Amino acid sequence: KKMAFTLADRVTEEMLADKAALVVEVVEENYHDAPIVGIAVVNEHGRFFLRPETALADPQFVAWLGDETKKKSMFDSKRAAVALKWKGIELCGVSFDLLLAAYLLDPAQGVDDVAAAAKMKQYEAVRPDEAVYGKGAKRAVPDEPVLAEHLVRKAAAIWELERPFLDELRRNEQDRLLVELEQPLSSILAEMEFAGVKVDTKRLEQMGKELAEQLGTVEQRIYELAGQEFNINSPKQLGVILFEKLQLPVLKKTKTGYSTSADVLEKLAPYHEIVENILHYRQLGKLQSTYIEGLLKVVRPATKKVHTIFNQALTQTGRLSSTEPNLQNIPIRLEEGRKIRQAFVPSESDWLIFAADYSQIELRVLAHIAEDDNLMEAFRRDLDIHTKTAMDIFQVSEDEVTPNMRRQAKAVNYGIVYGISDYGLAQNLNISRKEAAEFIERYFESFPGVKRYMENIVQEAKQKGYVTTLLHRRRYLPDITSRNFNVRSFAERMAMNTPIQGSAADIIKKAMIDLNARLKEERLQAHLLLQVHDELILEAPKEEMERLCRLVPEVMEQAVTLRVPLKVDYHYGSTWYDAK
DNA sequence: CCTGACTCG
DNA sequence: ATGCGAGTCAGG
Ligand SMILES: Nc1ccn([C@H]2CC[C@@H](COP(=O)(O)OP(=O)(O)OP(=O)(O)O)O2)c(=O)n1
Ligand SMILES: Nc1ccn([C@H]2CC[C@@H](COP(=O)(O)OP(=O)(O)OP(=O)(O)O)O2)c(=O)n1
Ligand SMILES: OC[C@H]1O[C@@](CO)(O[C@H]2O[C@H](CO)[C@@H](O)[C@H](O)[C@H]2O)[C@@H](O)[C@@H]1O
Ligand SMILES: [Mg+2]
Numbered sequence: 001k002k003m004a005f006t007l008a009d010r011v012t013e014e015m016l017a018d019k020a021a022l023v024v025e026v027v028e029e030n031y032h033d034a035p036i037v038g039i040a041v042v043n044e045h046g047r048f049f050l051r052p053e054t055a056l057a058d059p060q061f062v063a064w065l066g067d068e069t070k071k072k073s074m075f076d077s078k079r080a081a082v083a084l085k086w087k088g089i090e091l092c093g094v095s096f097d098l099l100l101a102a103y104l105l106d107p108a109q110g111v112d113d114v115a116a117a118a119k120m121k122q123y124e125a126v127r128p129d130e131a132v133y134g135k136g137a138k139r140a141v142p143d144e145p146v147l148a149e150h151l152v153r154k155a156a157a158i159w160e161l162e163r164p165f166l167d168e169l170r171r172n173e174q175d176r177l178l179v180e181l182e183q184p185l186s187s188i189l190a191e192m193e194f195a196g197v198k199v200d201t202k203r204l205e206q207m208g209k210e211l212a213e214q215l216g217t218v219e220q221r222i223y224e225l226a227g228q229e230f231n232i233n234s235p236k237q238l239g240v241i242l243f244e245k246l247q248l249p250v251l252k253k254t255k256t257g258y259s260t261s262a263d264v265l266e267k268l269a270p271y272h273e274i275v276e277n278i279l280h281y282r283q284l285g286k287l288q289s290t291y292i293e294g295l296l297k298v299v300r301p302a303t304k305k306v307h308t309i310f311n312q313a314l315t316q317t318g319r320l321s322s323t324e325p326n327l328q329n330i331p332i333r334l335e336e337g338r339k340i341r342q343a344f345v346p347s348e349s350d351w352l353i354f355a356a357d358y359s360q361i362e363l364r365v366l367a368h369i370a371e372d373d374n375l376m377e378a379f380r381r382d383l384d385i386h387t388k389t390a391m392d393i394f395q396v397s398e399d400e401v402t403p404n405m406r407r408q409a410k411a412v413n414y415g416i417v418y419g420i421s422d423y424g425l426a427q428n429l430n431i432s433r434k435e436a437a438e439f440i441e442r443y444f445e446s447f448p449g450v451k452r453y454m455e456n457i458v459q460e461a462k463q464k465g466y467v468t469t470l471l472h473r474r475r476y477l478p479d480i481t482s483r484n485f486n487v488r489s490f491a492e493r494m495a496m497n498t499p500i501q502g503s504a505a506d507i508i509k510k511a512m513i514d515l516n517a518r519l520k521e522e523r524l525q526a527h528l529l530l531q532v533h534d535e536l537i538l539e540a541p542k543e544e545m546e547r548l549c550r551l552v553p554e555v556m557e558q559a560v561t562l563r564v565p566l567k568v569d570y571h572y573g574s575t576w577y578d579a580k
Numbered sequence: 581c582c583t584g585a586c587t588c589g
Numbered sequence: 590a591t592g593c594g595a596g597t598c599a600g601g
Contacts, residue, residue, distance in 0.1 A: 233599055235584060256583065256601080286586040289598050317594060319589080326596045329588035337587080361589095362593095414592070421591035486590055497593045501589095505594095533589040533594085 001125060005047035005152040007145075011058040014045035021159035022072040023151045024080035024091075027133055027141060030324050031079045032193070032307045033086045033300075037141050040151035042159045049148040056087060068092040073158050075099050075114045077183075078312065081190040098158050100182045101165040103313035104174050108476055111313070114154040121164045126153040174472050181471065182312065185509050188516050189310045189320075192528050196305035197327065197344055200575075201296065204343040208292035211284060218281045225274035232281055235260045246272055263427070283334065291331060291340045298325050305347065310531070317498050318473040318505035319533060328532045330576070333407065341577035346539045352572050354526070354545065355579040356552045357535035358508065359567035360385060365503050366417060368562040369470075372449025379564040386410040393429065416443050417450055418500075419493045454496045461495035469502035470560070471510075507566075508534060511559035518555055522547070537576065545572055 008015070020043035028034040039050040055061045064070050065084070073096040074080060081091045102111040102120060111117045115128040132150050133139050141147055169175040223229045226245070230237045239258035242248045248268050252259040260278075268275045299306050311321045322328040330344070331337025346352060358364075363385055367375035378385060390401040390409035401409075415425065426436035444451035458480075461467050466476040475498045480491035512531060519526055526540030526548055536556065540548060553568040560566075573579045 231600075233585080234601080236601070254584075259584085261585075282586065286598075290587075290596095294597070311595095315594060319594060321595050322588095323596065326588080329586095329596065331587065333588080357589095411592090416592075418592040423591045425592090427591090489590070493592065501594060504589095535589080 007049045011061045016064040017043035019071045021155040023155045026083040031083045038151050040155040042155040047152050066090040066092050071095040078186045078190045085194045107316045118157050126157040196307040198347040200343045215284045222277050318502040342575045344576035353576050353579040354538045354572040356570040361534045362500050362504050367564045370450045370453035372447050376564045418497045458492045458495045467499050471506035473502050511556045515555045
């Protein structure tokens, strides 16, 4: 615990070796336009600390940073790349990212800093970030001496941990997943985040003004029906109004009291007309707080752009998550909410939004992995299982299936293949439990391969203690052999779902890499804006639409080659809303 | 701060 | 006990 280093005040030649562990410290969680508090470099020649003003204004250091031939090893390179972009500097040459390495080895570890990654290899010559910066209102950058040693130790750890981590990834056959998929994806996500999505605040604000009025009307209507005023957004107060004052049936209780979830309220619709109004109120209320007010709070005034952050090392299945703001959960299911999408527009005049989504993606992936003849045959015949299920459930013809019915059927298809109980299905379709049980049985009867697969994958998981995806992503499930019925059950269902969702995640990620290269290749101006799990959203001049209508679907469909074909749907328009 | 509500894939 | 994976919000 005695590490010597150089607290430099000027950049030297030895600090620019062609191989180094680099630390560009951004303390603020949201690194967009966030300050860089310090720099640390560790290479063949030594350990150095540099103040941001010093290094980032140095022509040789900036050149080194942007030199792809000068290899850098880091932890969360995207954070540094984006922070540097906001500082007008280009970062190239990142050959190793410890965050992604740790993430691939075991998502469950929740590695959020170098220290946490270090503990995976019994390395402890580095402190946790939280211990150094403190938490909450106490969070602060320590005195230079302390800060300097911290950043240098983190760089030292990355320097010493690279081989051990690559070694383990190599043994798990995940080294290519890191070097050829996640790392190149990281750079793509950095570009996407920095580019941002332009927002039509004039329109969003007008929508918010009108929403407030409509919300106000529903609010009064609710108080009138309840014969009293109360906080509708308080499940507690609401419970008293519904189950005590109004005497409605209590269909479910949670640890804190009566449940007022949407599923329960919808079931109480026949008893009082105040329940439908409350449901509507909550929807409108969510639109206002989150998609109007909340979104407006994160819009960069000067450019009218929103810059989300795609967490690439968080989900347990390989998916990405989106935060501050979350642009992966913008309304679309209900027309009222869907209009929020009219506020998301191109960043340049005469540009359009282009959206492409994978068709029945996880059913296709499951057909491949399970090798279910019927299911594979269905996709080879280009059938729509969601629509068919809709036709069967609602007892209607193909042309009588509304997009809403299809969505409900969609949830039924995925719920069944992922282990929904008869109780769950019955409650969802408001049908007899026996009926639901028969529907499920009949479902696997139709797809025996899938049934066998799910049974086998659970057994494999119990023996190996983990499951894997097509591209070797991994997830450990230690609870799978648990004595407790509940604990075990959840683990088993994770064994049934993770490989499928995870593989779908592997595919779209590769599609993004392939698409990006194709774009830069054809010198097209079109560029990715967002990824929404199984869909990619781009913007580009209208003149490039024709090319994209072929390129995007193609690249996405050819990302990987399965036993069944991949199909991509796509549309474009003046706003994200119109891209339908 | 945790719950339970909304939103999406 | 009762498909999976996520984030943000107001109220507790
Ligand atoms: N050293 C390696 C080897 C493989 N992979 C990932 C890349 C995606 C997938 C490619 O597997 P292949 O080697 O092409 O086939 P395989 O390993 O035989 O796969 P399978 O177990 O399904 O036969 O695994 C990796 O990340 N690192
Ligand atoms: N209720 C849902 C909806 C989606 N998903 C997962 C698997 C499908 C994936 C992508 O979502 P969708 O595109 O809505 O599903 P899809 O099968 O691709 O249906 P569509 O053909 O309309 O794209 O997310 C899920 O687990 N449960
Ligand atoms: O830079 C993203 C990277 O950092 C982690 C851990 O430090 O998450 C931080 O940043 C996220 C985006 O701003 C926040 O949602 C999160 O709260 C904050 O700790 C990793 O999880 C992530 O991969
Ligand atoms: Mg889809």
